[PDB]
Amino acid sequence: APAPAPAPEVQTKHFTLKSDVLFNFNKATLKPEGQAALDQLYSQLSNLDPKDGSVVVLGYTDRIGSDAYNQGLSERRAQSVVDYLISKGIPADKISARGMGESNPVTGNTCDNVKQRAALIDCLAPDRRVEIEVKGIKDVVTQPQA
Template structure:
């Protein structure tokens, strides 16, 4: 179980677009050294979490200097995540002497596969609640469990909880984490290995782009208008 602290910087881009095979093939894991301030969200393996489009998830402590100071092996983590703000000379290593040719043949490349599924919190929970309803469990069975086989060999399931802007950041952060954990726990009950699931709460830091709701609407209509922000996103990664 992984719970994330306040993430105050939202990731730009289309979080709901499906990722193409070609894009996925270019993305590699960035494993940071667990020393000092880490300006990116990481999982239990110290691997930087990415969005469906390959963008690294920044924490509220992110800055160009922090991205250049946090190391991922011989190079700063920012060389992979934010190469446009890191000096190029910091992202260059001296090439090692080529190793002798291996006698064994190179194995065939494995094609990565990813699916991203967005579930409305309304379909999963009661308003302002974090306990899955029977209808919510059925929605997960239908939209997530039934699709796990589509990615071949399952590698990782990332469950992220999101809220609307009503209420404090602290309250929404806790609620989003509880909802992500509830979905994760249900997936484990249905047979998904717990060590292949990450649960992350983003609170209200990642609203859906293009949804605009004026406070003048009144509370009931405002809650209805903000519904797209209240969601749980499940990203399934595997390999054929």
């Protein structure tokens, strides 16, 4: 947890990981294509710089009418992701598993015209996504419009 006096701009790289790829109806267990993608992303995060050695994993869950329940799932999934991300050869101390639960409900917008239970639970899917926050990572110069 160094913090002497950072002069250069930190290289924060947020990765949008879809819960559908990992787990949709399942608790948080990772599925094949789930572990596979997690591996490729892992490397991109493994070749990072230790300077900041800060990798916070965020988890976004949907609304089930039980805040406590949503938080429990947010931490579980966030943990399952990290738990698997560790076996990739990364210190469990350099990372962090956080349950983002619902820090910004997008559905409350894309699902505005939705006031029905089933309609909500169905429209409340766009709230299932983990955001891997890796800083201190370096990369080659990006070319405008791939």
